[PDB]
Amino acid sequence: TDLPRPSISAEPGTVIPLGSHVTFVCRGPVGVQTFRLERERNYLYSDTEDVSQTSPSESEARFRIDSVNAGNAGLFRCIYYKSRKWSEQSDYLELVVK
Amino acid sequence: AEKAGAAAGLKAGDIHGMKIVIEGLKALKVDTLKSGIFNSFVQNSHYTEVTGLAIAIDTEMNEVCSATYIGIHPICVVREKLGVIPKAGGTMVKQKDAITNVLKQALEKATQSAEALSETTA
Ligand SMILES: [Pt+2]
């Protein structure tokens, strides 16, 4: 039941102009029950229970903001909850607003 | 004479049972929410409705402490005390359940403190 390290990516990019949308993608193994997007301060997070099977071995969740402002910029990382235990956290991603 | 004593004891026990739990709510910083739930509870009394206050506290906190939110809000720090920040390999712990355990501690605090001053007056 060791849970693999998840990963974060940002679509369409790491750098977004003010007012545009961006989407954080958390990917992990199959069967994750909850995904959590976290900022640098651990107490600021979003949980979601919609996970989509991308692959027979992977699953993913999406957190979108419809338009950025300078308060959205910072470090972001994921954790997932599957099979009675929380996972390890992913590496940080920095999204910057222009 | 007995009636008036029971009524005065009920009044004293209500007013005193609420103060300890207002300490409880401002420990959670129900103070900083701009909905105004805190001020509303203090104006309307009815202290043992505190578990009611619980569910709104969750909804609002979820909205204002999300990774999406624009700006920083003082209430978010209280989550660490609630225990909803997870160590790797730990159980999930639901925020609403932690909030209800905080204010159940507050409410049984209040009831057994009010039971003494109900009997004290008479
Ligand atoms: Pt859960």
Numbering used by the authors:
A (entry chain A): 108 to 205
B (entry chain B): 190 to 311
Give excerpts from the publication.
RIFIN also mediates immune suppression through activation of inhibitory immune receptors including leukocyte-associated immunoglobulin-like receptor 1 (LAIR1) and leukocyte immunoglobulin-like receptor B1 (LILRB1). Notably, human monoclonal antibodies that contain LAIR1-domain insertions in either switch region or between V and DJ regions have been isolated from donors, who have had malaria.
The RIFIN-V2-LAIR1 complex resembled a razor with an exchangeable cartridge, where RIFIN V2 is the “handle” and LAIR1 is the “cartridge”. Helix α5 and its adjacent loops (α4-α5 and α5-α6) were connected by a disulfide bond (C254-C265) between α4 and α5; this region (hereafter referred to as the apex region) is likely located distally from the membrane, as the carboxyl terminus of the V2 region connects directly to the transmembrane. The interface consisted of backbone-mediated hydrogen bonds and extensive hydrophobic interactions with highly complementary shapes matching between RIFIN and LAIR1.
